[PDB]
Design a protein around this nucleic acid. Structure first.
Length: 160
RNA sequence: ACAC
């Protein structure tokens, strides 16, 4: 599943207790313990929705020991193959418009909506190949559509 | 330096 979070840009002395306080104060449930390394940690959310909520509400915003947090879907390096998530999609944008951008970098085998409580839309994309997803990520992360900057990232590709 |  897509419930595991990566938490990056952490203080030298950030520990599980701090992260437990951050999620409590942001009222984001977590499904298990926090595993703190050096500058980054991992934690599981009960479902994909809460994981996405944690990303939207904490990433780049939440400061901790003066350092702001990065929160992303945790994706093992080996599983960065064909699948992306695109966030901050203009709310009522027709899928023909989004798709016309996606096809410019490869064959899109699947394109699915992630229903979110923000105004913007979120979709999960599967391209034919690793090379195509990499290109689509390079050219679509940061692309300005209407007035929204698209946010593109890997999600686990567990079938390759 | 997304865990080794």
């Amino acid at each position: 599943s897509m419930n595991k979070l990566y938490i990056g840009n952490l203080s030298d002395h950030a520990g599980p207790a701090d992260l437990e306080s951050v999620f409590k104060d942001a009222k984001i449930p977590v499904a298990g313990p926090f595993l703190v390394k050096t500058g980054y940690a991992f934690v599981d959310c009960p479902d994909e929705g809460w994981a996405l909520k944690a990303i939207e509400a904490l990433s780049g915003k939440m400061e901790l020991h003066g350092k702001p947090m990065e929160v992303e879907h945790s994706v093992p390096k080996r599983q960065r193959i064909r699948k992306l998530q695109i966030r901050n999609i203009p709310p009522h944008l027709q899928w023909e418009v989004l798709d016309s951008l996606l096809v410019q970098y490869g064959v899109v085998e699947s394109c699915e909506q992630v229903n979110t409580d923000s105004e913007t839309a979120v979709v999960n994309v599967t391209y034919s190949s690793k090379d195509q997803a990499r290109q689509a990520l390079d050219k679509l992360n940061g692309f300005q559509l209407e007035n929204f900057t698209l946010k593109v990232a890997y999600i686990p590709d567990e079938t390759a």
